[PDB]
């Protein structure tokens with residue numbers, strides 16, 4: 001994986017992210033002053049646990065669809081066998097959605113973009129999942145302190161996805177090789193943009209997996225109780 005291989009890998013990932021980012025950073029930032037009123041928040045809080053589950057499930061389904069598109073536009077991902085493509089997406093797509101959230105998060109007031117406006121944690125009260133949602137907000141809060149660029153988000157989420165340590169892979173060595181190349185491409189791009197300092201500031205890999213596991217547990221129950 002030479003210099004042209006590494007640089008082409010960078011450009012390609014950043015392109016693929018720009019085409020699949022779902023919401024433009026510019027729009028998200030412009031919308032920061034569009035905040036839910038006290039009445040609108042109360043409105044959300046009065047909703048049934050079942051309605052909130054439906055609305056959040058819809059939000060997540062759509063977010064996941066763009067992540068699946070992101071992976072398909074990654075040359076290398078398509079070269080893997082069908083089993084491995086599915087293993088990576090099952091294990092990683094929600095982890096990517098978790099990371100992608102920090103762009104739609106405003107650290108100044110602790111609000112997130114949801115169904116057209118920015119709103120706090122308390123919007124989701126009816127779900128009865130305050131501890132989980134609080135950890136999600138905390139995770140986005142810590143990421144926002146890094147001020148990730150669009151291209152950094154692009155490369156970092158590619159690395160969340162292309163991880164050879166997912167159980168159930170059949171061509172492990174081939175996924176490893178793709179991961180190693182993406183790691184080098186990420187490091188390389190950070191050096192060219194004088195952003196090497198964020199590397200020591202990235203969360204431990206277990207943090208995101210751990211958050212996602214607990215997230216998986218809760219949504220599996222809601223699905224079993226009230227199928228979408």
Ligand SMILES: Cc1c(Cc2ccccc2)nc(-c2ccco2)n1-c1c(Cl)cccc1Cl
Pocket residue numbers: 052053055056057059060097098101112113114124127129132133136137215218219222
């Ligand atoms: C509320 C929520 C949950 C927990 C949950 C979801 C469904 C049923 C029960 C509990 N998870 C996410 C979430 C976003 C990104 C990944 O997960 N949210 C979420 C957040 Cl924190 C902010 C905006 C939009 C959404 Cl949907």
